[model samples]
Target chain A: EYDYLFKVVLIGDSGVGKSNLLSRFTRNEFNLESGVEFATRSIQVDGKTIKAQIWDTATSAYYRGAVGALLVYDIAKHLTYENVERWLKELRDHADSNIVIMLVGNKSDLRHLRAVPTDEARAFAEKNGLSFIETSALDSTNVEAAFQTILTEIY
Target chain B: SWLLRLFESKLFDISMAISYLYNSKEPGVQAYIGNRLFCFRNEDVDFYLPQLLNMYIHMDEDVGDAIKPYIVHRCRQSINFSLQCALLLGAYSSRGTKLRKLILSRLAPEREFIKSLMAIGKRLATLPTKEQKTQRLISELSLLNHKLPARVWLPTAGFDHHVVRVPHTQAVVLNSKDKAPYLIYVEVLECENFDTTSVPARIPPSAVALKEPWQEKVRRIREGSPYGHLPNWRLLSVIVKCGDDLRQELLAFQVLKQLQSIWEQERVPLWIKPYKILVISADSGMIEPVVNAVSIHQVKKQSQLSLLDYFLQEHGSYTTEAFLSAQRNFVQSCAGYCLVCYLLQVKDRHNGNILLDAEGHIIHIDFGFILSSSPKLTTEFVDVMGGLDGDMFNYYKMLMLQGLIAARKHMDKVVQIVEIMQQGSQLPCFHGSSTIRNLKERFHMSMTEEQLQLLVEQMVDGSM
Candidate 1:
């Protein structure tokens, strides 16, 4: 079917590196009142083609539907992570309760000033029913891994 | 498995695969074949495809035979691809009849969309081999004044904007990311309007629209000398309800596209597929930030008129035979559309998504909410009164009921989509809301022919 499709939203504070992670994962790159990021790629997870539409923000269009989300944060700043719960609350308030969410800590390359430890972030994700991973858009470390795992989780 | 690295949306692995193809330690084109890859996005196909096709053309005889099955397999998902990919191989004449047959076999001759695919695939398959057509195409690609084969034609003249005709029987609408406009089409018109430095943000231009009404313009245009009539084209373009998420809009279209194919396969009233084109990043890294993409369908700046206006215009005239005929057409098409919306559980309805075509047929575009995920709060069936009597209510009701019955006969196929996505996990709709269960409940297979008929009758009766 030509219309075979998949969708996910990116939610976090502005500088959680959502856009950069988006640009890296997608070779190219949004719209907002309900701006849709346009770069659909078909991928095979276990045994199928997935077409993903990325909406980096929200306004409760989730009842319409959403399959996955990337709850990104900056590991360099605890403020971004502090807002993680608030972000999750905002997402749950708007998105479908059952949609897939991944807790992403970006800027892992900021090793010298890493404010968020890997264990705490991982455990935080584990405790909250969210998958977790760290990425450095600076050097694109674990960016692709974070994406694949989230998609795999959604599948 | 000959090639183990298979996944979706990966560009680097392609370079890695490209590395295996060469003789030098340097990553090069000396490649292997039979890579079992399944990509789902039109954007994704454009990623490594042209490279692979170029390699396929340049491959040695020994390796040429090696790639047949894999390339053929890729063609199986022809509908999932942009027409560019089909013609990319066509441009080179590398794809043999074998692959074309694979694509050809999938098409249904009776269906319009399938026929369009057939037209594209046939031209690509038949175009003479690599050097010959490629050379001709390159020369043609350069000239602003040129002729593409009749198989694929561009609108010769238009109001504003550029249209580039390419090899493999393709006419591309580069949305200025590929937005780099060739002044050819605009210069042909000779009237300067929008500044071209920043690709003006607007709808991805698809078909040509006339500045005036259909009859008045076409008749006048045809009367002119050949060169003079060329520049008069314009658009009755569909205004899309653009929002923050292009993907949200895309899924709505994706579902609509999926539904169109299913309806066609079932021999039902055909859903219109707009003449929209999406560009795959053909130039990729060669360009700066933009990817020539029709991220969404056609949108035009001004729309003092709506589909509702078009409907009223047709009926605005006094009582007449054609008016009555147009009125009935509007009622029937609208009713059929409503039935589709109801069955698909399409949500997020508003003026922007509801549009009409030239024939007065109501075409529903966006499909964000599907699989019974309605946010309508409460559901109550209401009777007709957009302005009419008892005769009006039954007329619309029976029309929709007839359409629903026709589609209901093929409910098995429709129901199977939920199962396909449910088991497959490719769509949010299958998992969105209580959708899968909602669909299964609504389209119950256990219900008999008469029982289904009685159920629809009650649905119609309850509306009153």
Candidate 2:
């Protein structure tokens, strides 16, 4: 085993494609059954192993205790983007006071069906002091970089 | 996608679904399995994972092999129920038999992961579906993967990647391209823990647990140190980060960044990666200068040492390289650092603080005597390589001059960074000195060819 473990929790609303991003990033199956509240995968960045826990969001004691987070949302759904403020607040409420967060706009593939603009998401992420990047988890574009960038930032 | 759901449809029974999940290696599948198990009724606990293991030993080679790598990698990344599943996967299944000889060999002796294997090993042995003898081998592996926070990727960081190939090698420093290179490495090690025989080969002589994330603990003394050729806690990558008896060290960091910002504008792709100095508080700043080089002292200690001989000795062969490339890199860094020293008015020019990386470049640490208004014009940092009169020496100087020319092109940017720091009035060190104006004149970014040549000729002659 390597020398470090960091907890990076992925939080967002349902169907905002959080599962798909984890699926595509870790290349695993989406086999959660009923009552499967969260999923996890470990990724390596700079020789450090990060056990990234993905959870449905609401500000709470556990959420506040985490070291890092990825606030994922679907570019094809404006509503998902609209609801992220609450997710951000929930994260702030429960996450470590200095928690590192990334505003990930996953599923950049659906250009013709786009609902949320990239600039708008980038602006929102910036205004809140978070790193921003858009990715196509379906095509695996920026998925690895997204995870790694967030991990590096955490370090 | 329905692919997983469809695949599981044929394998929907609890026992069958466990097989699908174990053999599937799907995220949601594992998530589903872990979720189901989390709420598992006490009645089924006896046979739940026991039967799932029963068939995992017999999974399709393609199916098992594909899923095995991820699970094996995850074996020691953390201590959670996931590890409980992985630790006990083969122990109780099929009378304690399972797949992956590679995984077994690695996991068996691993010190940290083995604990879960043992605790779970004990728990699994008492289950409804009793295990047999081979499960003992599963119990055996838990001893080796010790004092590490990373998922155990095998052949270890010790194996010479050049001489022989090892499977599943992951970088200790993965994203060097964009990463700041390294941390300030604030602590000076006692060097007492340099045990060559241990699993990690070395450990920090402190109470910081090795199993925790290393970034949370210690930045290791990576491979640049000689085989016990170092002081017990010697830091080869950094000879001296500077004694900050004065806040002049903080000023040095600011100066380092400003210079890097300028050199960053060089037209050719040639680059100089500068270390980072982030202000944590007014009294101290976190310095994360890249610490991947050996000190000049280490280079001199080797018996057969050419200045760059180490580049060829262990780093290259018929199947390897870095022979000439190291020379080129050394040339580039020398030019960059030399220009940097001159512009910054670096003083106390001595042999002790200069460092050389594996790539054969020289690195200067800290800025002392900041903004030296009357910088020692002639004697600062003379070239130490012997026999400066040799034709090769002259040729090398020519190379450096050209390199210096490239670096000079960025003087405007460097000057820009200097001006910005002053404008920001961010550092107290710069407040009263003629730092910006002095650097602009000394740097001569505006100089014509004849002047640069004459100045460089006289400068190199005097420095050498």
Candidate 3:
């Protein structure tokens, strides 16, 4: 049992490594996705065990009253970045106004192939009042920090 | 002619007696037939045992008393493997007090009946081919007799020898294919009549329409001047599902049907199509397939395209009249299921269980996992219809809120249904101690309309 069970939904365009980001964050394993799969990981936040229940889909009952959201996109795909505004609109429309959101640019291992610049994504997140992070779930880079940061933010 | 009658009666005594046993109601005739039928070898007894067992399980106490000696004689003298298996499986199917006792009483002390069931399971396990194992199961379950014309058997009806069909290419789905429910068209002989004493009622042949029944067609004909006719030799389709307990599904569907009525009174039709499920045995049953619908799984397999792409392919573009109509169908159905999903906590929502009809309405089927358990194409419902800002979204919101409010009004009735079903405690889904509590918790009866409205908004937002 955990002190706080925070429901966090992952939102992004299809094939944006949302599932990988989740798997790598929840378990050390990065894997592939359906019908709203869930993964829960307990993180220590100021001496309390905060269980982050990460869900891939954000339907009303599952995510409306949720505490946080991971707004994911592929850094290697510029088109994914362009759709960030739309997903943000969805969160604003559906999620609680107080819900904490993280703008996550995944697939950072593809640094050489990166299409969206880090500064631009950071600036977008700052403008939208979301925590910004770039993570590579494939290599387990910044994956832990991304989730911990969100859970901490919610806490 | 008198000599010919004497010869025919003398030679056909057993057949004549069995026919009388099937047709007659008088105790004298039944007693005479039972005595004569018992004289045959146990192997001969095995041939008529399914019919006798069917009679014993469902017929009157007097009929059971008449057939008791024949049943005991067959069970005591010799244990035919299939017959014993049939007795045990038949016990599972029967419901009435005396019927269940009569079917189970002969088999329980023997304990050999269960061993026989397990024996067949062992052999089926060792069976080399997946096809062969399924055939073995089919033949075994076929012995659980049904009330139909003797020669009429759906492939899954256990009278496989009576069902003759040419070998054809088998189009089967994957993983659950061996246990998947399938439809078989049974051909009826023109002269054949169903037994009135049996559970099946015989309506006039013209009344059996494929899409809509005769009454609906007749009403249309009178009101709008329509046309119709029926065939001489009828091909009626019946679904046979093996290896799943439909008792659970039956209860779930029944509750949903009740909920549908409640919603209808509130004038917020949520488009929940609760179909017919008849549980014949623990692991085998018959289902009535919803008319003119294909599953998303089937569509995906057939077209190699996702749901949205398939919609585009079918309707030719997003802005077409056909497309908008389909979108309307999708949005309404999607909203209905969203409410259902919240209320039922239905799980395993892959493509296979969700269906798309001819007119584009989405139907959810197969509630094998629900009520404390747990759509991707639904994203399309939002994205295709227009995002949260559009009229489609507003319509969806309206439907969702109205459905929630309506359902909450009837919460006590729904609760009573579940509590009554909870008395049937052995259902697998009910194993979760929290199942009942979870169901009640979902309604949030203590919450007000404003809170509910906000909750629905949050849910819609979260879904997007």
Candidate 4:
């Protein structure tokens, strides 16, 4: 008797605010404490309990096995953007089937230092059949809506 | 008397075990004591045998008599050696029927002399039956498989444990405990497949595939101009399969759900929005098919070589303290990470594995070589001496003294970290799950408040 029961996972590079996004949507909180790898493992939201299973995979040669990854990278750090595809490939081999995936560009507050364009990211999402979003967990921009959109698609 | 002789000869030195056999002219006698010594020392006997023989020949008779008490001390050593070998052989025999056969064949050459030993081994095997043998083997292996000295314990409340068989791969078991069950299961990930270099370039668009927004952001970042001479963001890919076994997948889901709760409590933020988990069972060729995938942005910049690189422009000469400060920061960060790596039992701490962002933050990328410790030892020590220089050593010593003085300041944080890790064992994916219940009994040790203070002090000093 659940309105919508789905599993949403966040995967990304370390420090991309995957956990922040989940916090904004599920619990309406944003924390920047260092060493909080991935945001939520699997969270339940909106009475339907989508169970956000989050995995913050270590970007090293080890610990890539945590599946259903939400690859995160900072928008201000252009170097992080360049490494996106490699992280995606890491997910393909080690994740679970039907793993809900998305691409996130974080730290919108650093617009002046933006290295990755929104359109380019959207295009990649289209080509790969993934949903896309740009968010700032710091300012609480588009964070809630992003989770709702993904959850709706999943359900 | 042999025990007395062994001690008198300083045969306990371990290096002497081998030469003792070689010096004996009679193969029969040589083989007798050799086997005993060989079995006594096992792997160590070979290295120390020569030294032991030298000690035996040079010592005077009165000296030997004087050492009689010490020689008798070797009785305990011989027993320890025998028991260890017996246990090893017992464990090895359970690997498979083929292993059992191989063991039997090896024992054939010494069949006559080994009759009594074989009889005892046979009796031990029969008492445990085949099923018990497998269970005992699994239990023993589980106990022996520790790669870290840090003990993670299973929670006593609100969780269920179950084991599932994954075809072709080893059987995976899942445990749900506390708010972060998946954290424990995360240990089951095979270390070999974690090679980051082998990841593919992309995931092909397919019916089963779903993508998220971060991918595009990453693509843009990759195409962007280099940030301070850093490399473009490159894609590394891996594929995961969701086979017919829904149970294992569901277990994964459960763990993820719990992890979400933990993150919420910790108050960490998430970005790269659309944090959705995707399933990919089909082949994508250039794009690896993964059971779950997520995309994020990364720095395309290659790591800076050394402090020298920032300076020495076209002239290849020395620069001022500007670049030197940056170099110092880099080294300090490395020291911090090395300290953490040692505390966590992370074994791989090479230069290439550590990365620096444009902001100059030190990041550790690989976790495959983590958690390397023996199950027998409760407290594992990391040799920070390898990473420190003369100047750094002084700074480290200072920090240790400071940490000791301010022990109360960090006690809570240290205990919390320990507790979190200890609770991690409650989940089933950890190799030490079952044994974790008897952690104190099995490991028989605990970190005292004073000990914790000392360890933290050492870490602080070594890394400073």
Task: For candidate 4, write residues B69-109 as lDDT tens digits.
Answer: 22223323433222222322232221223322333432222
Cα lDDT listed for each candidate: 0.46, 0.48, 0.62, 0.36
lDDT of 1 by residue, A18-84 (tens): 7767776786321111044535556677776677666664256642477887889887568988998
Best by TM-score: 3
Top candidate (DockQ): 2
Q: State the DockQ, from 0 to 1, for candidate 2.
A: 0.08
Candidate 4 stretches greater than 4 Å from native: A1-5, A32-49, A57-69, B1-464
User: Which of candidates 3 and 4 is the stronger one according to lDDT?
Assistant: 3
What is candidate 3's lDDT per residue for B1-464, written digit by digit as tens? 23224323555444345555655675534544565564555555543343455456555766666666555545444322323434334433433344344444423322332243334444454455556655654555344223222333332222222221211111111223435543433433232322112222232123222334433533332222111122323333445555657766766776777578788999995677877665555655556666567788778788898677887888758788898888788788888888887787777877778888866788888887777433233565567567768888789888988998898888866765565455424556677877878788888888899998899888877664
Local accuracy of candidate 2 as per-residue lDDT tens digits, B243-320:
122234544554555455544544432335555333212322234445455456655664446553555574564235
Positional deviation of residue A140's Cα in model 3 after best superposition, in angstroms: 85
Best by lDDT: 3
After superposing candidate 1, which stretches have Cα over 4 Å from the reference?
Answer: A1-155, B1-211, B214-318, B372-389, B416-430, B448-454, B457-464
Report the lDDT tens digits of candidate 4 across residue range A7-119. 44565555566666666666666543434344443435555555444433333333333333355667655677777788677666655556556777887764534568888
Q: State how far residue B286 of model 4 sits from its true place (Å).
A: 62
